[PDB]
Design goal:
PDB class: transcription/dna
Bound molecules: chloride ion
Helix content: under 10%
Protein name: Runt-related transcription factor 1
Keywords: transcription-DNA complex, AML, runx1, chloride binding
Organism: Mus musculus
CATH architecture: Sandwich
Shape: globular
Order of helices and strands: EEEEEEEEEEEEE
Number of domains: 1
Number of strands: 13
CATH topology: Immunoglobulin-like
Subcellular location: Nucleus
Largest sheet: 9 strands, antiparallel
Radius of gyration: 13 Å
Length: about 110
């Protein structure tokens, strides 16, 4: 239930692993929390990428706000960052107009995981 800051003062998130196995269910369901006043049903997506891969494959990367929290049911990281690299996670909140926030830490995704 721990929340951390994103690089936007309007959004917090739950905590993800620093390194996880490709396609494996996460230990803690991902959440995005609005501090500002965001309407129920507001869509939220996550995208992962790096210099070698603009949008790595994910699963279940869309959620909807309910009472200022968007809970991703089973977000999974499919694409591998693999070799000496990691991914930056961008959160897009579909208010009008949309807002972006970056998850605070890079995430490494490998076939074996930690
Ligand atoms: Cl990919
Ligand atoms: Cl790998």
């Amino acid at each position: 239930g721990e929340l951390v800051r994103t690089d936007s003062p309007n959004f917090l998130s739950s905590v993800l692993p620093t390194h996880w196995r490709s396609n494996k269910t996460l230990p803690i369901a991902f959440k995005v929390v609005a501090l500002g006043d965001v309407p129920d049903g507001t869509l939220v997506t996550v995208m992962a990428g790096n210099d070698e891969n603009y949008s790595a494959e994910l699963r279940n990367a869309t959620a909807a706000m309910k009472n200022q929290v968007a809970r991703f049911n089973d977000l999974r990281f499919v694409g591998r960052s693999g070799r000496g690299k990691s991914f930056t996670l961008t959160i897009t909140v579909f208010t009008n107009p949309p807002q972006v926030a970056t998850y605070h830490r890079a995430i490494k995704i490998t076939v074996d995981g930690p």
